[PDB]
């Protein structure tokens, strides 16, 4: 009774162990058939107490399972929890049945890696079963064909006649048998999201998690289990990513016999989930990738699963827009002609599209009122949106817009309206971030409010791009249109009502790009992606900082995905300056675009913009859509460098960046990786190298003093 | 405003910030005062909401707390967590007031450290209320006078009309400025507890933790962070001990913001606890030490205290006799004949103690029943316990019982009597470890009939000596004497119960040398040192392996209630043959004992026997009673040595051990610690040495081959 | 590199102290400073170069730079503290001193006293600073 | 003649020594080294000053390895490359605590400062002149200070 996923060149194994247990068996390269998960002696450990009391080998404390519970004689954290009317939390889940089928299903009111054909995966469904309570768990497995891409995901059902409460509904659990790891996570904070962080596993309990109701810019929902001598190039590296946007656990569990728990879901931690006789709760899915490539590898698997399998829209495959984002040069204080007059500037210099910021609608002149009043300031816009974007379309620009339809200011006609639509708690003072309350998401009226509001503008002007933004976290958490037992349920079903609300409004726009937002890259998860194609990375847009941000960042989401724009030095988040040749090079190795005032830029530096523009349009599709390999961590030392490779490998882009000056400093070279080893390639401008020349010897890097240094290379096959 | 409590040469100080709330500011070495007008303003740090829309400068999550909560702004994982019978889960304590008395308060139904005169110690009661729901917490710290210890508790009291539900009670939370520590805590399992495990902090969440019903072999309930160089002998420490038995969390969480939050109590998984109008709930509390003496700074403080002023009872100061557990000897299979006769060469070896083990109740032939059945077996003593303890007494031995009174076998009278008596679930298959289950604490009826059941059994005799066990871990957790919203109470109820059938047992019997047992170390914490003087540390008695073990348990714990016994060879736990010199100068370094057949020993092995009894009884008050140095970690190498130190430092006592050895070897040499440097000492069978030269320079190890080969050297100041 | 002229004042005053620029290039205001800065150096001059000298952050093992000078008696000090890479929204800054007198209070120079313990067993709260490569200078002296 | 100076005041101890040619033929020093010592452990970390013009003595602390360690100037100048002094360092110890063994040479020339661990686990500390094309010829009735 095994279970055997073919997933790339990986291999996922369970097996249905004694009487009705699921035991995982194992994780990594491909192999033809595991004969050994049949015989091996039990042992009898110490106060590990036994379901069969005539066994004592067995136990369920010592068993690698795939969805396991608490009291059950296991003493490691459980997978789920579940508490029944008598007060009970002991739970038996026992194998029912298994189905078979080509493709990979839809998640129900969630976000999902997809697939165009049947061909590219194989989805495995296990059934598990407690005849007493009549809880049904389904275990969702899913193996794609081209990738080593395994999906995770659980979908409870009541089939009983009792009330089942959800305490903990994790996506997965997975046991190893050995624990001698490192573990990466990606914490942060803003303006400085994502940083790469290794770290030796401790026997016990590690975890990134947020409880924020947001993926946060504090902890990104991804852990990877790494082997010890794993780095960017080489190793075995196992990734844990969760797509869901909201609250999340990412956890490891090491036991007294070095075995390793890897779980991942919604975040146990002020939640719960009623499940009344017949209703059902379906858990977003984890994707889990294996590499014995390096970090690059994963990460590449990726960068072409999230990009082509998860990203939705006519945008998915589609070269992103070059743009500029006005909000430094009027603030809240604009209007039609200001903006169309340096409309004008930017379109000259061969940016591709004009975004409006915040302050555009009701009485929006700073950021203590108007949030929920979505209607066209009269004054700054006296022929609205519709005629400031038609006189920017006959410039040659796209138009874009700026929206924030989650929050309500408490000074709004919405709030004094509806006091009752925000997060609240009876009688408790209703705290604030931003001078702003959050609207509850988990009420319908709400949701479909938004879904009007929000689509009838959009549809007002000739609108082909929106940036969706969100600058607070929840606090006071609670609905007036819930029952006090599923009052814990407010944050997963807001997150749930965020899901609807963008799915139908992007729905019925399908020719606006959507960039997810909040407050940078505070919701930069695999969750938001499946609904826009690209992300705003982090409010910090310091060449340097942007170093460590980008190179964090790529390590799960793909290029294509994430902005990167010049802004103005002295830099706004850190006061730093920098040359605005290194400025481009950074924001030139991802999705490229523009934030500063140009009335403030000097001559000489509105003509680096214009050479920049038309660069980056050369290798637009080489950077979006290309190979990406990492090659100097930013995290390790003194230096950044990567490079984007074409498909054919024919094409290349080299990124390099030093940022602390050296004087006297020792020669410096630099090796590439991805080339075609056995062609030539030249380096414009340096000269003719050999593929396996660059790879295995390098190149010598030229000498440079000066204070944070970039430099990019264009390669091509003789 | 401020609170500035002075313990030792430490100082902990508290002030409180505008209204209501409660700061922590500083915890570490004694200063004069710490200046309460704040260096330099707050700041308003993106997403981290404000309680005061005014003041984007204050925020909860960026305010350090000593008893914090979620949702009312700060993000991080609370000290507490309440739920109202509305659903929220947001509740708001305010500065009500506080008192300040002389002396330690006793904790309701709970051990605790105490004191024997008010001038020992100041505790500082802070009353702190959320006067909507009318939730009462006080918050409970005592300094004491003479040692760096800080002990910190709460109790919560329901003061309102409404049902208020507990969903999380830690004892205690401390928010560190700053992150830059290394964490150590005490993984292992049966077999090897306690091992030390130093690890770098992570940014995320850290936990030891138990779910198991009780303290565990797995973790021991006591993390402590230390400074980056900080070791055995220098550097800054910071200790957190839980006094209790049962499950327990000690998490540290690094923010966004590199603060440290430690936080430690009862396990908030799988726990609640409801409070209904007039009803409170106190907690255990936890001792925090200081240190910049280094680990071995720490662990005298917890020494002194847990000697001194948390073990009670006549023999709390008392040198604890030399026993011998005749387990291996007859096994289940015994008769008065055969102990009494054999007993009686036992007492001409000097031994002052016989202890009667397993198998002398009810049906025992087995493992897999009678317990519960707490009557003599009349066929292997016919004339009982007062016949055999009698018998024992007039060779001139102490007489030893063993027990496990908190277990029930399912063959057995009392559960075919009483089979709701234990711990279980509606309707789930009872799990059995051991073929045994447990009996459910949490009822006052099953405590009342164990009480005396016990005691009857213990008074029908002239026993001075109890080894009281337990060889299990909970599972199906419940109770059928409570209602299902109590449910989740079992688990702390059972050791509530535990706790009081124990207070009154011991207090019924003060003639009683307790000692506790868990299958070993299995509940080798605070919370059992309170009512039981000792602890048996590990079930493996290999020299080798206790070396490890002992180093370990010598962190928190005071020698004197570390046993440690001589066992025979091969080892039954490893199979290592080491040499019975070895063997007793490792279980000299302890609450020394025996652990074997004497009639398999060879008759040069009785001699080395007799010497070993009548070493043990020189060094006796020494080895227990006086200060503990560790010299030499086996944890970081291929040694292990330490050394005790009488109070006036006028006599010492040097134990050194080496593993494996090595061919050709290098010198050894070993440094000695915490002696008079201006005074001379002679070493038994060297010559004499000055203390400055031990300490400074040391002193040349002899050149020995074989493996898991040991010394020992008597110190005496001339 | 460039370098704010208060910094590299700091990080000068902290060795033996002098200048290598042309004055006939400076504005008024730099020059200016460079008088402020002169007269500062006379008045910690004998107490750098000749008192007691405290390394407290090492430039090799971290992003930060700080030493500080004690006199004999210990009644009097100069502390300087380096931060070379600013952090966005970075976490809160503290510095712990050396050399003082436990029993004795010390007034910073525009901060207000603070027990010399406090300064080296809790240390002192540091303000927070954006831009690159900045320096704090602190005057100790004894009540 | 070994030269050795302990001052009252301070842990200073100062090394040197003094070479005479009393006999009737020519004694050549292929190396004269003013001080060596050997420490009976060799659990140390060793620190040294490397470094080059624009950026000198450069703190950098290595563990201490099975074979020879030097850090030495063969430029006629104690060097911006190599400043002559090294120093043994307790594994915990910091710049506020732990035992420390500092060796500086008082010359401006080339100059070997050199840590050698041999089979025994003991620590040969040796400085002074580098040996390296380095002699000196002794005449009857000449001398040599290091």
């Not at 109701?213 to 080489?234: C, M, R, T, Y």
Request: net charge negative; with cysteine; aromatic share 12%.
């Amino acid at each position: 009774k095994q279970f055997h996923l073919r997933a790339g060149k990986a291999s996922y194994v369970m097996q249905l162990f004694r009487s009705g247990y699921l035991a995982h068996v194992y994780w990594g390269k491909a192999v033809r058939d595991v004969r050994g998960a049949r015989a091996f002696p039990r042992l009898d450990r110490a106060f590990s107490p036994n379901p069969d009391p005539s066994d004592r080998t067995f136990s369920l404390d010592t068993l690698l399972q795939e969805y396991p519970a608490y009291g059950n004689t296991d003493f490691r954290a459980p997978a789920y929890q579940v508490q029944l009317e008598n007060g009970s939390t002991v739970t038996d889940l026992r194998y029912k049945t298994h189905r078979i089928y080509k493709g990979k299903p839809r998640l129900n009111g969630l976000p999902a890696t997809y697939v165009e054909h049947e061909q590219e995966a194989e989805t495995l469904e296990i059934v598990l079963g407690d005849a007493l309570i009549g809880l049904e768990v389904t275990l969702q497995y899913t193996a794609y064909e081209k990738w080593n891409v395994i999906t995770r995901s659980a979908r409870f059902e009541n089939k009983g006649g009792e009330r089942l409460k959800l305490l903990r509904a994790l996506s997965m659990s997975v046991d190893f048998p050995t624990a001698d790891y490192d573990w990466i996570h990606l914490p942060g904070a803003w303006g400085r999201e994502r940083w790469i962080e290794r770290r030796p596993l401790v026997t016990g309990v590690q975890a990134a998690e947020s409880r924020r109701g947001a993926s946060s810019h504090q902890q990104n929902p991804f852990i990877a289990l790494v082997a010890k001598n794993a780095d960017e190039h080489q190793g075995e590296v196992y990734g844990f990513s969760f797509v869901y946007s909201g609250n999340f656990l990412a956890q490891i569990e090491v036991d007294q016999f070095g075995t390793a728990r890897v779980s991942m879901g919604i975040n146990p931690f002020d939640f719960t989930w009623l499940l009344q006789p017949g209703e059902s709760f379906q858990t977003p899915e984890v994707v889990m990738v294996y590499s014995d490539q390096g970090l690059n590898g994963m990460s590449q698997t990726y960068h072409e699963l999230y990009r082509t399998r998860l990203a939705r829209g006519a945008f998915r495959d589609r070269e992103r827009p070059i743009l500029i984002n006005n909000w430094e040069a009027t603030y809240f204080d604009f209007n039609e002609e200001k903006i169309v007059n340096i409309a004008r500037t930017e379109a000259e210099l061969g940016i591709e599209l004009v975004v409006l910021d915040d302050g555009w609608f009701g009485e929006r002149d700073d950021d203590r009122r108007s949030l929920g009043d979505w209607i066209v300031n009269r004054r700054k816009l006296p022929n609205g949106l519709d005629g400031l974007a038609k006189q920017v379309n006959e410039l040659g620009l796209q138009f874009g817009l700026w929206v924030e339809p989650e929050m309500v200011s408490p000074n709004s006609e919405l709030y004094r309206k509806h006091p009752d639509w925000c997060l609240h708690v009876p009688n408790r003072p209703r705290s604030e971030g931003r001078n702003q309350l959050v609207l509850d998401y988990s009420r319908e009226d709400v949701c479909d409010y938004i879904i009007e509001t929000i689509s009838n503008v959009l549809a007002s002007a000739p609108i082909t791009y929106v940036k969706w933004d969100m600058n607070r976290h929840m606090t006071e958490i609670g609905s007036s249109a819930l029952p006090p037992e599923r009052q814990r349920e407010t944050a997963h079903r807001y997150m749930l009502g965020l899901y609807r609300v963008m799915d139908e409004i992007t729905s019925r726009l399908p020719h606006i790009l959507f960039e997810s937002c909040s407050g940078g890259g505070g919701r930069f998860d695999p969750g938001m992606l499946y609904y826009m194609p690209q992300t705003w990375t982090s409010d910090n847009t310091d060449a340097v900082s942007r170093l460590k941000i980008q190179y964090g960042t790529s390590l799960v989401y793909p290029i294509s995905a994430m902005g990167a724009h010049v802004s103005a030095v002295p830099n706004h988040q850190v006061g730093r300056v920098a040359s605005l040749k290194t400025r481009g090079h950074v924001a030139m190795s991802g999705n490229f675009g523009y934030e500063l005032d140009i009335t403030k830029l000097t001559e000489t530096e509105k003509q680096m913009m214009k050479q920049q523009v038309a660069f980056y349009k050369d290798v637009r599709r080489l950077v979006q859509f290309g190979t990406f390999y990492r090659l100097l961590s930013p995290f390790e030392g003194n230096e950044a460098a990567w490079m984007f490779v074409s498909a054919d490998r024919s094409e290349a882009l080299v990124a390099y960046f030093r940022v602390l000056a050296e004087a006297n400093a020792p020669l410096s070279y630099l090796r590439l990786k991805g080339l075609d080893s056995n062609q030539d390639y030249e380096i414009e401008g340096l000269g003719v190298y050999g593929g396996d020349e660059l790879v295995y010897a390098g190149v010598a890097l030229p000498y440079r003093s000066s204070d944070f240094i970039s430099m990019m290379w264009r390669l091509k096959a003789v």
